[PDB]
Amino acid sequence: ALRFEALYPEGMCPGWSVVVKGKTSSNTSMFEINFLSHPGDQIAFHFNPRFASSRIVCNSFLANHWGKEEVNKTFPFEAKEPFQVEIYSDQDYFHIFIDENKILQYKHRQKQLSSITKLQILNDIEISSVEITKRG
Amino acid sequence: ALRFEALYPEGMCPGWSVVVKGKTSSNTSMFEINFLSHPGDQIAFHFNPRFASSRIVCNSFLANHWGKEEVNKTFPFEAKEPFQVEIYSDQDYFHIFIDENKILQYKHRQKQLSSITKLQILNDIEISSVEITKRG
Ligand SMILES: OC[C@H]1O[C@@H](O[C@H]2[C@H](O)[C@@H](O)[C@@H](O)O[C@@H]2CO)[C@H](O)[C@@H](O)[C@H]1O
Numbered sequence: 001a002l003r004f005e006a007l008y009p010e011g012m013c014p015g016w017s018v019v020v021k022g023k024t025s026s027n028t029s030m031f032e033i034n035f036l037s038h039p040g041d042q043i044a045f046h047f048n049p050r051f052a053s054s055r056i057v058c059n060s061f062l063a064n065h066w067g068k069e070e071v072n073k074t075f076p077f078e079a080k081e082p083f084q085v086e087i088y089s090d091q092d093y094f095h096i097f098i099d100e101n102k103i104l105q106y107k108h109r110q111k112q113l114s115s116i117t118k119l120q121i122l123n124d125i126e127i128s129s130v131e132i133t134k135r136g
Numbered sequence: 137a138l139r140f141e142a143l144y145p146e147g148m149c150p151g152w153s154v155v156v157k158g159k160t161s162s163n164t165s166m167f168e169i170n171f172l173s174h175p176g177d178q179i180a181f182h183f184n185p186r187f188a189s190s191r192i193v194c195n196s197f198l199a200n201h202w203g204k205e206e207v208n209k210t211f212p213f214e215a216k217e218p219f220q221v222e223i224y225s226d227q228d229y230f231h232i233f234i235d236e237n238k239i240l241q242y243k244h245r246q247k248q249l250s251s252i253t254k255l256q257i258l259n260d261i262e263i264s265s266v267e268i269t270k271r272g
């Protein structure tokens with residue numbers, strides 16, 4: 001189920017932060033934050049905290065296939081507790097911060113950064129805020 | 137031309153703030169921030185700063201017609217200068233703040249507040265940030 005979508009047709013990468021605040025409703029499900037590229041609505045970056053297994057899975061869906069999963073060692077979420085996820089892009093990576101701690105970096109696989117125009121947030125997250133900001 | 141759109145299907149009214157930061161490119165054009173209701177993509181609230189005439193025009197587009205225009209006396213924008221517009225909804229009004237000063241309130245005409253799921257920002261605004269936040 002789609003919880004939030006945003007579209008910035010001029011391109012929101014690189015040099016933009018997305019800050020999502022919210023909490024899960026359960027400790028048995030998952031949510032995802034997806035950055036999509038145009039045309040094709042391919043998934044340049046898929047950020048997928050899975051609470052049933054306490055794993056953050058990151059990947060990209062390009063040319064009709066998921067790539068190699070990048071799975072973080074730590075799981076700094078607590079079910080039903082408010083969190084803040086910030087995703088900031090530079091020329092080389094998406095940088096992920098949770099509750100103001102840097103957690104992981106994901107190297108760009110979709111190199112056409114300016115075609116990343118859309119953000120989708122799906123599944124088990126009760127959103128309290130989404131901020132999309134040009135950092136430089 | 138569409139500059140930004142956001143969708144929150146659970147309904148982003150009442151009790152939400154939208155904060156838009158940016159600047160115009162010219163002093164001869166206009167921009168608008170529209171809150172849209174589902175179904176129909178009717179315009180529950182149209183906020184339209186017009187720089188050619190230095191007037192903020194507010195209105196609603198419901199049942200295929202524009203209503204009575206509500207035109208603010210003051211114009212607290214400067215072309216090409218960064219501004220911050222905050223639109224906060226309670227049960228009775230949209231409250232508009234520009235650069236942290238309250239400017240105007242617009243009484244709800246679309247009373248089905250929970251059907252307001254979509255925000256669109258159009259025309260002459262170079263966006264630096266959009267924040268959509270549940271205030272209470
Ligand atoms: O890699 C991201 C996608 O994973 C898919 O699930 C994988 C699963 O993580 C992996 O263990 C493997 O065994 O096969 C599954 C199917 O590809 C999800 O279905 C998908 O939504 C993404 O999260």
Ligand SMILES: OC[C@H]1O[C@@H](O[C@H]2[C@H](O)[C@@H](O)[C@@H](O)O[C@@H]2CO)[C@H](O)[C@@H](O)[C@H]1O
Nearest residue numbers: 182184193194195196202203204205206
């Ligand atoms: O009321 C909001 C809409 O106004 C339309 O322009 C009006 C104009 O403001 C008014 O002076 C009147 O004379 O007729 C025009 C057409 O309705 C805009 O075209 C529309 O985009 C809204 O801003």
